[PDB]
RNA sequence: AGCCAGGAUGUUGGCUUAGAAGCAGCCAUCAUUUAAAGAAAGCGUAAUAGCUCACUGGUCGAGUCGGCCUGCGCGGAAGAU
């Protein structure tokens, strides 16, 4: 429901961390709110996705880049990597050392933390206006 | 700024202080640890005796840590005890229920020392003179 | 009684036009206010104007105190300027200034447009804060009142367009 | 028909003690707190000092009815008066405790043998106000010129003479 | 009168009460550095906390306030073509 007014994603993410007591990991980042919620950013490729009718959500590679988000997008993408790092001492060491890593390893490391019940990846999309549901499934 | 606040007011029986009515919500919220507090709390309160009603004022450091100053047992409590009576009357002193010596009032005045507003222990004693009257102790010489 | 006898002290050569009942204050900032005052005498004097009743009238000495207040007010007008603060409270309420017309999403079906009279302008630091600047003290608070008439602050959660800061004591909902 | 005695009497009591006072200190302090005054009054009475807030109406009338040592004439705004009856220094020393804490630009003046001392100059005099250590420093300047400079010089010159 | 500032300490007085805590109720109805602050006049999480209060000192620089007797007015005052 990010099409609805008064919606801002980031506070909800903080509310889970504060009240409920597990760490959210934003496995997307939004593009806009109210009307302006008419795309999403995929942190994993740092690409961004659009819907028109239902049928533009068929188009599913380089649909856009995250544009003028980029400063916010950086710290969250670091937090994405930071989260995949702590799943073992070995991944953590590779991060500290000064090396870079892949989307496939990101999914494998993250998936162990989700599966064990450590880390809760947050995704986003208004269902009613047919935004992001297909993207939401991909994460499932 | 830092998660620090000073002189927060607390009254808890001396050296036993674990549960949520004694520790409140504030120890949990400010990151403070009850077990670690109990160890610090026994360490200034043993000498003046455990199990007494204690005034304690807590100052909080943002390392999830604590200091505490005790303003010693309250004079009203200490006078009631030093004259021995179990509890005052619903018409106290006017229709009294016990007695206190002046030598007993002065003994309170030394325990409350620097924390008494009066000029000297005779003035200070005169301050707790009115407290001792208020609780229904009849003043023997 | 006192402040029928507080006699201006005109700051920095303000333009004072005296018609024997009408006074017009001109300047830069607070330019071109006017007032028409009958039962009173106002002498220009040494930049330190004199207010009293015309011919010792019983009902005219009230209005001598009024004359003084409007005159001191116009002096504040050309010096300092006047009540800025309107702001909007709680979810989804937001407003954009468009020339001298203010469009406000105050949650009506049609986002409302309020247009300003001649002496006065506004602009918004961000869409939830509105700052008004204008010549005449009566006109500026009237625009604050007429905006505040679109939504009075509703006291359960304080939501509304709020002039100045404080406006309501607030209360609980279900309570006890 | 003006039957209130409190204002007529309390001027007289303050005039007697403020004439009797040795050094006194005149400060301004809207924005006071009970705590800071209470601890300072507490130690002051050991040292032979009272520190007071009194009406300015009362102090001006006190200067009017008798010539004043501790003022020339009263000062605008609120006025606090610290004054000492035993140790002469003491009234100013309490200001040098107080200045560390709440407010330090409060002092308008202090009076010393009835001459007025402004806010900057008092800060040196009040730092050392004890006479014995002051007599020793007045003597130290004269004692260096009189007898010290000769004896210190000949010891440095005998050390040069037996090193060559 | 406004404006600025203080508006405390023993002490969360005693009792009663789940709570009783200046401010539900009863009894004390005081003392203390004090220039001053009632063991409290009203609000306040019904009460812990929070806000104002008489009272205290500035700015302020003149009349001011409470009663009563008494003329006159006011609202209280809504019906049948």
From Swiss-Prot, chain A:
Coiled-coil regions listed: none
Binding-site list for GTP: 1-3
Positions of disulphide bridges: none
Localization per record: Cytoplasm
Top-level lineage group: Bacteria
Family note: Belongs to the TRAFAC class translation factor GTPase superfamily. Classic translation factor GTPase family. EF-G/EF-2 subfamily.
Biological function: Catalyzes the GTP-dependent ribosomal translocation step during translation elongation. During this step, the ribosome changes from the pre-translocational (PRE) to the post-translocational (POST) state as the newly formed A-site-bound peptidyl-tRNA and P-site-bound deacylated tRNA move to the P and E sites, respectively. Catalyzes the coordinated movement of the two tRNA molecules, the mRNA and conformational changes in the ribosome.
Protein name (database record): Elongation factor G
Provenance organism: Escherichia coli (strain K12)
UniProtKB/Swiss-Prot annotation, chain B:
Positions carrying N,N,N-trimethylalanine: 1
SUPFAM superfamilies in the cross-refs: Ribosomal L11/L12e N-terminal domain, Ribosomal protein L11, C-terminal domain
InterPro entries to which the protein is assigned, alphabetical: Ribosomal_uL11, Ribosomal_uL11_bac-typ, Ribosomal_uL11_C, Ribosomal_uL11_C_sf, Ribosomal_uL11_CS, Ribosomal_uL11_N, Ribosomal_uL11_N_sf
Alphabetical keyword list: Methylation, Ribonucleoprotein, Ribosomal protein, RNA-binding, rRNA-binding
Keyword Secreted: no
Gene3D superfamilies: Ribosomal protein L11, C-terminal domain, Ribosomal protein L11/L12, N-terminal domain
CC annotations in GO: cytoplasm; cytosol; cytosolic large ribosomal subunit
Highest taxon of source: Bacteria
Annotated positions of the N6-succinyllysine modification: 71, 80
Pfam family, one: Ribosomal_L11
GO BP: cytoplasmic translation; ribosomal large subunit assembly; stringent response; translation; translational termination
GO molecular function terms attached to this record: large ribosomal subunit rRNA binding; rRNA binding; structural constituent of ribosome
Chain positions with N6,N6,N6-trimethyllysine modification: 3, 39
Stored PANTHER family: 60S RIBOSOMAL PROTEIN L12, LARGE RIBOSOMAL SUBUNIT PROTEIN UL11M
UniProt function note: Forms part of the ribosomal stalk which helps the ribosome interact with GTP-bound translation factors.
Assembly, per entry: Part of the ribosomal stalk of the 50S ribosomal subunit. Interacts with L10 and the large rRNA to form the base of the stalk. L10 forms an elongated spine to which 2 L12 dimers bind in a sequential fashion forming a pentameric L10(L12)2(L12)2 complex.
Family: Belongs to the universal ribosomal protein uL11 family.
Name this protein carries in UniProt: Large ribosomal subunit protein uL11
Organism: Escherichia coli (strain K12)
From Swiss-Prot, chain C:
One GO CC term on file: cytosolic large ribosomal subunit
GO molecular function, one term: large ribosomal subunit rRNA binding
InterPro entries reported for this sequence: Ribosomal_uL6-like, Ribosomal_uL6-like_a/b-dom_sf, Ribosomal_uL6_a/b-dom, Ribosomal_uL6_bac-type, Ribosomal_uL6_CS
Keyword Signal part of the UniProt annotation: no
RNA-binding keyword on record: yes
Listed SUPFAM superfamilies: Ribosomal protein L6
Family according to the record: Belongs to the universal ribosomal protein uL6 family.
Protein function: This protein binds directly to at least 2 domains of the 23S ribosomal RNA, thus is important in its secondary structure. It is located near the subunit interface in the base of the L7/L12 stalk, and near the tRNA binding site of the peptidyltransferase center.
This protein's name: Large ribosomal subunit protein uL6
Native organism: Escherichia coli (strain K12)
From Swiss-Prot, chain D:
Signal peptide feature range: none
A GO-annotated cellular component: large ribosomal subunit
Coiled-coil features, chain-numbered ranges: none
Molecular function via GO: large ribosomal subunit rRNA binding; ribosome binding; structural constituent of ribosome
Stated family: Belongs to the universal ribosomal protein uL10 family.
General function of this protein: Forms part of the ribosomal stalk, playing a central role in the interaction of the ribosome with GTP-bound translation factors. Protein L10 is also a translational repressor protein. It controls the translation of the rplJL-rpoBC operon by binding to its mRNA.
Name under which the protein is recorded: Large ribosomal subunit protein uL10
């Amino acid at each position: 429901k990010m099409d609805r007014m008064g919606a801002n994603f980031l506070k909800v993410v903080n509310q889970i961390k504060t009240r409920l007591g597990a760490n959210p990991v934003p496995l997307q980042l939004a593009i806009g709110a109210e009307e302006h919620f008419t795309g999403v950013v995929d942190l994993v490729k740092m690409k961004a996705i659009n819907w028109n009718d239902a049928d533009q959500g068929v188009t599913f590679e380089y649909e856009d880049i995250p544009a003028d988000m980029v400063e916010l997008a950086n710290e969250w993408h670091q937090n994405l990597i930071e989260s995949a790092a702590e799943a073992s001492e070995e991944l953590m060491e590779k991060y500290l050392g000064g090396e870079e890593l892949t989307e496939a390893e990101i999914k494998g490391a993250l998936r162990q933390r989700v599966l064990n019940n450590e880390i809760i990846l947050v995704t986003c999309g208004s269902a009613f206006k047919n935004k992001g549901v297909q993207a939401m499934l991909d994460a499932v | 700024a830092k998660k620090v606040q000073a002189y927060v007011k607390l009254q808890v029986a001396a050296g036993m202080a674990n549960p949520s009515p004694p520790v409140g919500p504030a120890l949990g919220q400010q990151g403070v640890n009850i077990m670690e507090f109990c160890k610090a709390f026994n360490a200034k309160t043993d000498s003046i005796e455990k199990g007494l009603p204690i005034p304690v004022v807590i100052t909080v450091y943002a390392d999830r840590s604590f200091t505490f100053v005790t303003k010693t047992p309250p004079a009203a409590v200490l006078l009631k005890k030093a004259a021995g009576i179990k509890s005052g009357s619903g018409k106290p002193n006017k229709d009294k229920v016990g007695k206190i010596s002046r030598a007993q009032l002065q003994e309170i005045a030394q325990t409350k020392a620097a924390d008494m507003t009066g000029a000297d222990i005779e003035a200070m004693t005169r301050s707790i003179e009115g407290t001792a009257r208020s609780m229904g102790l009849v003043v023997e010489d | 009684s006192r402040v029928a006898k507080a006699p201006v002290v005109v700051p920095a050569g303000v333009d004072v036009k005296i018609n024997g009942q009408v006074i017009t204050i001109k300047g830069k900032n607070g330019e071109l206010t006017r007032t028409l005052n009958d039962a009173v005498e106002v002498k220009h004097a040494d930049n330190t104007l004199t207010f009293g009743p015309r011919d010792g009238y019983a009902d005219g000495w009230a209005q001598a105190g009024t004359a003084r207040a409007l005159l001191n007010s116009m002096v504040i007008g050309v010096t300092e300027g006047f009540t800025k603060k309107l702001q909007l409270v709680g979810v989804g309420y937001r407003a954009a200034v468009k020339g001298n017309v203010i469009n406000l999403s105050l949650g009506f079906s049609h986002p409302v447009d309020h247009q300003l009279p001649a002496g006065i302008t506004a602009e918004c630091p961000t869409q939830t804060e509105i700052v008004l600047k204008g010549a005449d003290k009566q006109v500026i608070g009237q625009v604050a009142a007429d905006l505040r008439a679109y939504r009075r602050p509703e006291p359960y959660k304080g939501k509304g367009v709020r002039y100045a800061d404080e406006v309501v004591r607030t209360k609980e909902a279900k309570k006890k | 028909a003006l039957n209130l005695q409190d204002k007529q009497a309390i001027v007289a009591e303050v005039s007697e003690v403020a004439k009797g006072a040795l050094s006194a200190v005149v400060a301004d302090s809207r924005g006071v707190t009970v705590d800071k005054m209470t601890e300072l009054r507490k130690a002051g009475r050991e040292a032979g000092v009272y520190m007071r807030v009194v009406r300015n109406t009362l102090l001006r009338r006190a200067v009017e009815g008798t010539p004043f040592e501790c003022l020339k004439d009263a000062f605008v705004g609120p006025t606090l008066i610290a004054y000492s009856m035993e140790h002469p220094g003491a009234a100013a020393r309490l200001f040098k405790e107080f200045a560390k804490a709440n407010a330090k630009f409060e002092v308008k003046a202090a009076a010393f043998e009835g001459e007025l001392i402004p806010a900057s100059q008092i800060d040196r005099l009040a730092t050392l106000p004890t006479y014995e250590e002051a007599i020793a420093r007045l003597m130290a300047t004269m004692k260096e010129a009189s007898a010290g400079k000769l004896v210190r010089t000949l010891a440095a010159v005998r050390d040069a003479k037996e090193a060559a």
